[PDB]
């Protein structure tokens, strides 16, 4: 849990962390990037969401 994020950054953080189809590697990667530059919240969340969706078992 991280409380240094306000709203969008926080949603992005927790959503990326929540993404089940996003493996620990990429999850921790996007999380790291989220923490490194919170300004990329929507961007990283977008990439992570799209990647999570793409990596969704089919």
PDB file of N, CA, C and O in Angstrom:
ATOM      1  N   UNK A   1       0.844  -1.213   0.000  1.00  0.00           N
ATOM      2  CA  UNK A   1       0.000   0.000   0.000  1.00  0.00           C
ATOM      3  C   UNK A   1       0.868   1.249   0.000  1.00  0.00           C
ATOM      4  O   UNK A   1       1.908   1.289   0.660  1.00  0.00           O
ATOM      5  N   UNK A   2       0.437   2.264  -0.732  1.00  0.00           N
ATOM      6  CA  UNK A   2       1.187   3.509  -0.835  1.00  0.00           C
ATOM      7  C   UNK A   2       0.229   4.686  -0.729  1.00  0.00           C
ATOM      8  O   UNK A   2      -0.805   4.714  -1.399  1.00  0.00           O
ATOM      9  N   UNK A   3       0.562   5.652   0.112  1.00  0.00           N
ATOM     10  CA  UNK A   3      -0.323   6.785   0.343  1.00  0.00           C
ATOM     11  C   UNK A   3       0.351   8.089  -0.055  1.00  0.00           C
ATOM     12  O   UNK A   3      -0.060   9.169   0.372  1.00  0.00           O
ATOM     13  N   UNK A   4       1.375   7.989  -0.887  1.00  0.00           N
ATOM     14  CA  UNK A   4       2.059   9.166  -1.401  1.00  0.00           C
ATOM     15  C   UNK A   4       1.353   9.636  -2.665  1.00  0.00           C
ATOM     16  O   UNK A   4       1.582  10.738  -3.167  1.00  0.00           O
ATOM     17  N   UNK A   5       0.484   8.781  -3.168  1.00  0.00           N
ATOM     18  CA  UNK A   5      -0.308   9.092  -4.341  1.00  0.00           C
ATOM     19  C   UNK A   5      -1.635   9.703  -3.922  1.00  0.00           C
ATOM     20  O   UNK A   5      -2.206   9.328  -2.895  1.00  0.00           O
ATOM     21  N   UNK A   6      -2.118  10.648  -4.714  1.00  0.00           N
ATOM     22  CA  UNK A   6      -3.331  11.377  -4.376  1.00  0.00           C
ATOM     23  C   UNK A   6      -4.579  10.650  -4.871  1.00  0.00           C
ATOM     24  O   UNK A   6      -5.252   9.974  -4.097  1.00  0.00           O
ATOM     25  N   UNK A   7      -4.889  10.776  -6.157  1.00  0.00           N
ATOM     26  CA  UNK A   7      -6.107  10.186  -6.698  1.00  0.00           C
ATOM     27  C   UNK A   7      -5.803   9.277  -7.879  1.00  0.00           C
ATOM     28  O   UNK A   7      -5.856   8.052  -7.759  1.00  0.00           O
ATOM     29  N   UNK A   8      -5.468   9.880  -9.014  1.00  0.00           N
ATOM     30  CA  UNK A   8      -5.224   9.131 -10.239  1.00  0.00           C
ATOM     31  C   UNK A   8      -4.018   8.217 -10.081  1.00  0.00           C
ATOM     32  O   UNK A   8      -4.055   7.054 -10.475  1.00  0.00           O
ATOM     33  N   UNK A   9      -2.959   8.748  -9.492  1.00  0.00           N
ATOM     34  CA  UNK A   9      -1.741   7.983  -9.266  1.00  0.00           C
ATOM     35  C   UNK A   9      -2.016   6.802  -8.348  1.00  0.00           C
ATOM     36  O   UNK A   9      -1.437   5.729  -8.502  1.00  0.00           O
ATOM     37  N   UNK A  10      -2.927   7.007  -7.410  1.00  0.00           N
ATOM     38  CA  UNK A  10      -3.268   5.984  -6.437  1.00  0.00           C
ATOM     39  C   UNK A  10      -4.086   4.888  -7.100  1.00  0.00           C
ATOM     40  O   UNK A  10      -3.813   3.700  -6.923  1.00  0.00           O
ATOM     41  N   UNK A  11      -5.077   5.302  -7.882  1.00  0.00           N
ATOM     42  CA  UNK A  11      -5.900   4.366  -8.632  1.00  0.00           C
ATOM     43  C   UNK A  11      -5.036   3.556  -9.576  1.00  0.00           C
ATOM     44  O   UNK A  11      -5.153   2.339  -9.644  1.00  0.00           O
ATOM     45  N   UNK A  12      -4.143   4.240 -10.277  1.00  0.00           N
ATOM     46  CA  UNK A  12      -3.238   3.583 -11.201  1.00  0.00           C
ATOM     47  C   UNK A  12      -2.374   2.565 -10.473  1.00  0.00           C
ATOM     48  O   UNK A  12      -2.271   1.420 -10.897  1.00  0.00           O
ATOM     49  N   UNK A  13      -1.779   2.990  -9.364  1.00  0.00           N
ATOM     50  CA  UNK A  13      -0.934   2.124  -8.555  1.00  0.00           C
ATOM     51  C   UNK A  13      -1.669   0.845  -8.160  1.00  0.00           C
ATOM     52  O   UNK A  13      -1.221  -0.265  -8.463  1.00  0.00           O
ATOM     53  N   UNK A  14      -2.812   1.004  -7.509  1.00  0.00           N
ATOM     54  CA  UNK A  14      -3.542  -0.136  -6.982  1.00  0.00           C
ATOM     55  C   UNK A  14      -4.142  -0.994  -8.088  1.00  0.00           C
ATOM     56  O   UNK A  14      -4.179  -2.215  -7.963  1.00  0.00           O
ATOM     57  N   UNK A  15      -4.597  -0.368  -9.166  1.00  0.00           N
ATOM     58  CA  UNK A  15      -5.135  -1.111 -10.297  1.00  0.00           C
ATOM     59  C   UNK A  15      -4.059  -1.954 -10.959  1.00  0.00           C
ATOM     60  O   UNK A  15      -4.275  -3.129 -11.235  1.00  0.00           O
ATOM     61  N   UNK A  16      -2.895  -1.357 -11.192  1.00  0.00           N
ATOM     62  CA  UNK A  16      -1.768  -2.082 -11.771  1.00  0.00           C
ATOM     63  C   UNK A  16      -1.374  -3.241 -10.863  1.00  0.00           C
ATOM     64  O   UNK A  16      -1.089  -4.346 -11.327  1.00  0.00           O
ATOM     65  N   UNK A  17      -1.386  -2.981  -9.565  1.00  0.00           N
ATOM     66  CA  UNK A  17      -1.080  -4.000  -8.573  1.00  0.00           C
ATOM     67  C   UNK A  17      -2.176  -5.069  -8.535  1.00  0.00           C
ATOM     68  O   UNK A  17      -1.927  -6.224  -8.183  1.00  0.00           O
ATOM     69  N   UNK A  18      -3.389  -4.671  -8.903  1.00  0.00           N
ATOM     70  CA  UNK A  18      -4.551  -5.556  -8.862  1.00  0.00           C
ATOM     71  C   UNK A  18      -4.614  -6.460 -10.090  1.00  0.00           C
ATOM     72  O   UNK A  18      -5.172  -7.555 -10.023  1.00  0.00           O
ATOM     73  N   UNK A  19      -4.045  -5.993 -11.196  1.00  0.00           N
ATOM     74  CA  UNK A  19      -4.131  -6.697 -12.476  1.00  0.00           C
ATOM     75  C   UNK A  19      -3.613  -8.131 -12.373  1.00  0.00           C
ATOM     76  O   UNK A  19      -2.416  -8.367 -12.210  1.00  0.00           O
ATOM     77  N   UNK A  20      -4.528  -9.106 -12.499  1.00  0.00           N
ATOM     78  CA  UNK A  20      -4.225 -10.523 -12.281  1.00  0.00           C
ATOM     79  C   UNK A  20      -3.445 -11.142 -13.433  1.00  0.00           C
ATOM     80  O   UNK A  20      -2.647 -12.060 -13.240  1.00  0.00           O
ATOM     81  N   UNK A  21      -3.666 -10.619 -14.629  1.00  0.00           N
ATOM     82  CA  UNK A  21      -3.053 -11.169 -15.827  1.00  0.00           C
ATOM     83  C   UNK A  21      -1.714 -10.510 -16.066  1.00  0.00           C
ATOM     84  O   UNK A  21      -1.001 -10.844 -17.007  1.00  0.00           O
ATOM     85  N   UNK A  22      -1.396  -9.551 -15.218  1.00  0.00           N
ATOM     86  CA  UNK A  22      -0.115  -8.885 -15.259  1.00  0.00           C
ATOM     87  C   UNK A  22       0.823  -9.566 -14.273  1.00  0.00           C
ATOM     88  O   UNK A  22       0.635  -9.457 -13.063  1.00  0.00           O
ATOM     89  N   UNK A  23       1.809 -10.288 -14.790  1.00  0.00           N
ATOM     90  CA  UNK A  23       2.708 -11.073 -13.947  1.00  0.00           C
ATOM     91  C   UNK A  23       3.497 -10.205 -12.986  1.00  0.00           C
ATOM     92  O   UNK A  23       3.581  -8.992 -13.167  1.00  0.00           O
ATOM     93  N   UNK A  24       4.090 -10.829 -11.981  1.00  0.00           N
ATOM     94  CA  UNK A  24       4.803 -10.104 -10.940  1.00  0.00           C
ATOM     95  C   UNK A  24       5.906  -9.231 -11.538  1.00  0.00           C
ATOM     96  O   UNK A  24       6.114  -8.103 -11.100  1.00  0.00           O
ATOM     97  N   UNK A  25       6.579  -9.743 -12.561  1.00  0.00           N
ATOM     98  CA  UNK A  25       7.651  -9.009 -13.219  1.00  0.00           C
ATOM     99  C   UNK A  25       7.152  -7.674 -13.763  1.00  0.00           C
ATOM    100  O   UNK A  25       7.613  -6.605 -13.349  1.00  0.00           O
ATOM    101  N   UNK A  26       6.196  -7.741 -14.677  1.00  0.00           N
ATOM    102  CA  UNK A  26       5.676  -6.548 -15.321  1.00  0.00           C
ATOM    103  C   UNK A  26       4.879  -5.704 -14.337  1.00  0.00           C
ATOM    104  O   UNK A  26       4.904  -4.481 -14.405  1.00  0.00           O
ATOM    105  N   UNK A  27       4.198  -6.360 -13.408  1.00  0.00           N
ATOM    106  CA  UNK A  27       3.437  -5.660 -12.387  1.00  0.00           C
ATOM    107  C   UNK A  27       4.368  -4.789 -11.558  1.00  0.00           C
ATOM    108  O   UNK A  27       4.164  -3.585 -11.439  1.00  0.00           O
ATOM    109  N   UNK A  28       5.415  -5.405 -11.022  1.00  0.00           N
ATOM    110  CA  UNK A  28       6.410  -4.700 -10.221  1.00  0.00           C
ATOM    111  C   UNK A  28       7.126  -3.645 -11.049  1.00  0.00           C
ATOM    112  O   UNK A  28       7.546  -2.613 -10.526  1.00  0.00           O
ATOM    113  N   UNK A  29       7.273  -3.914 -12.338  1.00  0.00           N
ATOM    114  CA  UNK A  29       7.901  -2.968 -13.248  1.00  0.00           C
ATOM    115  C   UNK A  29       7.061  -1.704 -13.393  1.00  0.00           C
ATOM    116  O   UNK A  29       7.555  -0.591 -13.197  1.00  0.00           O
ATOM    117  N   UNK A  30       5.787  -1.877 -13.724  1.00  0.00           N
ATOM    118  CA  UNK A  30       4.879  -0.751 -13.884  1.00  0.00           C
ATOM    119  C   UNK A  30       4.672  -0.032 -12.557  1.00  0.00           C
ATOM    120  O   UNK A  30       4.552   1.187 -12.521  1.00  0.00           O
ATOM    121  N   UNK A  31       4.643  -0.796 -11.472  1.00  0.00           N
ATOM    122  CA  UNK A  31       4.554  -0.226 -10.134  1.00  0.00           C
ATOM    123  C   UNK A  31       5.773   0.645  -9.851  1.00  0.00           C
ATOM    124  O   UNK A  31       5.652   1.764  -9.345  1.00  0.00           O
ATOM    125  N   UNK A  32       6.945   0.133 -10.205  1.00  0.00           N
ATOM    126  CA  UNK A  32       8.187   0.862 -10.018  1.00  0.00           C
ATOM    127  C   UNK A  32       8.169   2.156 -10.822  1.00  0.00           C
ATOM    128  O   UNK A  32       8.551   3.213 -10.322  1.00  0.00           O
ATOM    129  N   UNK A  33       7.707   2.069 -12.060  1.00  0.00           N
ATOM    130  CA  UNK A  33       7.613   3.236 -12.923  1.00  0.00           C
ATOM    131  C   UNK A  33       6.574   4.228 -12.392  1.00  0.00           C
ATOM    132  O   UNK A  33       6.754   5.443 -12.493  1.00  0.00           O
ATOM    133  N   UNK A  34       5.500   3.693 -11.818  1.00  0.00           N
ATOM    134  CA  UNK A  34       4.431   4.505 -11.242  1.00  0.00           C
ATOM    135  C   UNK A  34       4.984   5.307 -10.069  1.00  0.00           C
ATOM    136  O   UNK A  34       4.702   6.494  -9.919  1.00  0.00           O
ATOM    137  N   UNK A  35       5.784   4.643  -9.250  1.00  0.00           N
ATOM    138  CA  UNK A  35       6.396   5.274  -8.093  1.00  0.00           C
ATOM    139  C   UNK A  35       7.508   6.232  -8.511  1.00  0.00           C
ATOM    140  O   UNK A  35       7.746   7.247  -7.856  1.00  0.00           O
ATOM    141  N   UNK A  36       8.190   5.899  -9.596  1.00  0.00           N
ATOM    142  CA  UNK A  36       9.308   6.703 -10.078  1.00  0.00           C
ATOM    143  C   UNK A  36       8.812   8.016 -10.679  1.00  0.00           C
ATOM    144  O   UNK A  36       9.302   9.093 -10.332  1.00  0.00           O
ATOM    145  N   UNK A  37       7.825   7.922 -11.560  1.00  0.00           N
ATOM    146  CA  UNK A  37       7.222   9.102 -12.173  1.00  0.00           C
ATOM    147  C   UNK A  37       5.708   8.998 -12.147  1.00  0.00           C
ATOM    148  O   UNK A  37       5.092   8.530 -13.107  1.00  0.00           O
ATOM    149  N   UNK A  38       5.088   9.446 -11.048  1.00  0.00           N
ATOM    150  CA  UNK A  38       3.629   9.398 -10.867  1.00  0.00           C
ATOM    151  C   UNK A  38       2.868  10.185 -11.936  1.00  0.00           C
ATOM    152  O   UNK A  38       1.661  10.026 -12.092  1.00  0.00           O
ATOM    153  N   UNK A  39       3.579  11.027 -12.673  1.00  0.00           N
ATOM    154  CA  UNK A  39       2.967  11.808 -13.738  1.00  0.00           C
ATOM    155  C   UNK A  39       2.507  10.905 -14.880  1.00  0.00           C
ATOM    156  O   UNK A  39       1.639  11.280 -15.667  1.00  0.00           O
ATOM    157  N   UNK A  40       3.080   9.710 -14.958  1.00  0.00           N
ATOM    158  CA  UNK A  40       2.744   8.773 -16.018  1.00  0.00           C
ATOM    159  C   UNK A  40       1.644   7.825 -15.562  1.00  0.00           C
ATOM    160  O   UNK A  40       1.468   6.754 -16.134  1.00  0.00           O
ATOM    161  N   UNK A  41       0.916   8.229 -14.529  1.00  0.00           N
ATOM    162  CA  UNK A  41      -0.127   7.405 -13.931  1.00  0.00           C
ATOM    163  C   UNK A  41      -1.072   6.815 -14.971  1.00  0.00           C
ATOM    164  O   UNK A  41      -1.218   5.597 -15.064  1.00  0.00           O
ATOM    165  N   UNK A  42      -1.685   7.676 -15.767  1.00  0.00           N
ATOM    166  CA  UNK A  42      -2.660   7.233 -16.750  1.00  0.00           C
ATOM    167  C   UNK A  42      -1.994   6.447 -17.867  1.00  0.00           C
ATOM    168  O   UNK A  42      -2.581   5.519 -18.415  1.00  0.00           O
ATOM    169  N   UNK A  43      -0.759   6.811 -18.180  1.00  0.00           N
ATOM    170  CA  UNK A  43      -0.021   6.175 -19.265  1.00  0.00           C
ATOM    171  C   UNK A  43       0.354   4.753 -18.878  1.00  0.00           C
ATOM    172  O   UNK A  43       0.115   3.805 -19.625  1.00  0.00           O
ATOM    173  N   UNK A  44       0.930   4.618 -17.693  1.00  0.00           N
ATOM    174  CA  UNK A  44       1.351   3.328 -17.180  1.00  0.00           C
ATOM    175  C   UNK A  44       0.145   2.454 -16.903  1.00  0.00           C
ATOM    176  O   UNK A  44       0.160   1.259 -17.181  1.00  0.00           O
ATOM    177  N   UNK A  45      -0.905   3.062 -16.365  1.00  0.00           N
ATOM    178  CA  UNK A  45      -2.147   2.351 -16.125  1.00  0.00           C
ATOM    179  C   UNK A  45      -2.738   1.867 -17.437  1.00  0.00           C
ATOM    180  O   UNK A  45      -3.229   0.750 -17.522  1.00  0.00           O
ATOM    181  N   UNK A  46      -2.676   2.710 -18.457  1.00  0.00           N
ATOM    182  CA  UNK A  46      -3.179   2.349 -19.774  1.00  0.00           C
ATOM    183  C   UNK A  46      -2.408   1.167 -20.336  1.00  0.00           C
ATOM    184  O   UNK A  46      -2.999   0.170 -20.748  1.00  0.00           O
ATOM    185  N   UNK A  47      -1.083   1.263 -20.325  1.00  0.00           N
ATOM    186  CA  UNK A  47      -0.249   0.190 -20.844  1.00  0.00           C
ATOM    187  C   UNK A  47      -0.477  -1.092 -20.060  1.00  0.00           C
ATOM    188  O   UNK A  47      -0.577  -2.172 -20.642  1.00  0.00           O
ATOM    189  N   UNK A  48      -0.581  -0.961 -18.748  1.00  0.00           N
ATOM    190  CA  UNK A  48      -0.785  -2.107 -17.877  1.00  0.00           C
ATOM    191  C   UNK A  48      -2.163  -2.732 -18.084  1.00  0.00           C
ATOM    192  O   UNK A  48      -2.289  -3.948 -18.113  1.00  0.00           O
ATOM    193  N   UNK A  49      -3.188  -1.899 -18.231  1.00  0.00           N
ATOM    194  CA  UNK A  49      -4.549  -2.384 -18.456  1.00  0.00           C
ATOM    195  C   UNK A  49      -4.658  -3.090 -19.798  1.00  0.00           C
ATOM    196  O   UNK A  49      -5.230  -4.179 -19.893  1.00  0.00           O
ATOM    197  N   UNK A  50      -4.102  -2.470 -20.830  1.00  0.00           N
ATOM    198  CA  UNK A  50      -4.118  -3.043 -22.167  1.00  0.00           C
ATOM    199  C   UNK A  50      -3.307  -4.330 -22.207  1.00  0.00           C
ATOM    200  O   UNK A  50      -3.700  -5.303 -22.851  1.00  0.00           O
ATOM    201  N   UNK A  51      -2.185  -4.337 -21.498  1.00  0.00           N
ATOM    202  CA  UNK A  51      -1.324  -5.506 -21.440  1.00  0.00           C
ATOM    203  C   UNK A  51      -1.986  -6.618 -20.632  1.00  0.00           C
ATOM    204  O   UNK A  51      -1.909  -7.787 -20.992  1.00  0.00           O
ATOM    205  N   UNK A  52      -2.643  -6.241 -19.544  1.00  0.00           N
ATOM    206  CA  UNK A  52      -3.387  -7.189 -18.716  1.00  0.00           C
ATOM    207  C   UNK A  52      -4.503  -7.828 -19.520  1.00  0.00           C
ATOM    208  O   UNK A  52      -4.741  -9.032 -19.437  1.00  0.00           O
ATOM    209  N   UNK A  53      -5.179  -7.005 -20.303  1.00  0.00           N
ATOM    210  CA  UNK A  53      -6.253  -7.473 -21.167  1.00  0.00           C
ATOM    211  C   UNK A  53      -5.710  -8.378 -22.268  1.00  0.00           C
ATOM    212  O   UNK A  53      -6.315  -9.394 -22.609  1.00  0.00           O
ATOM    213  N   UNK A  54      -4.564  -8.004 -22.819  1.00  0.00           N
ATOM    214  CA  UNK A  54      -3.924  -8.792 -23.868  1.00  0.00           C
ATOM    215  C   UNK A  54      -3.398 -10.116 -23.322  1.00  0.00           C
ATOM    216  O   UNK A  54      -3.383 -11.126 -24.022  1.00  0.00           O
ATOM    217  N   UNK A  55      -2.973 -10.106 -22.068  1.00  0.00           N
ATOM    218  CA  UNK A  55      -2.432 -11.302 -21.432  1.00  0.00           C
ATOM    219  C   UNK A  55      -3.524 -12.084 -20.713  1.00  0.00           C
ATOM    220  O   UNK A  55      -3.239 -12.979 -19.919  1.00  0.00           O
ATOM    221  N   UNK A  56      -4.773 -11.732 -20.983  1.00  0.00           N
ATOM    222  CA  UNK A  56      -5.902 -12.441 -20.403  1.00  0.00           C
ATOM    223  C   UNK A  56      -6.078 -13.792 -21.086  1.00  0.00           C
ATOM    224  O   UNK A  56      -6.248 -13.855 -22.307  1.00  0.00           O
ATOM    225  N   UNK A  57      -6.023 -14.886 -20.303  1.00  0.00           N
ATOM    226  CA  UNK A  57      -6.128 -16.258 -20.820  1.00  0.00           C
ATOM    227  C   UNK A  57      -7.290 -16.438 -21.791  1.00  0.00           C
ATOM    228  O   UNK A  57      -8.433 -16.093 -21.483  1.00  0.00           O
ATOM    229  N   UNK A  58      -6.988 -16.977 -22.961  1.00  0.00           N
ATOM    230  CA  UNK A  58      -7.978 -17.144 -24.012  1.00  0.00           C
ATOM    231  C   UNK A  58      -7.790 -18.498 -24.690  1.00  0.00           C
ATOM    232  O   UNK A  58      -7.215 -18.594 -25.776  1.00  0.00           O
TER     233      UNK A  58
END
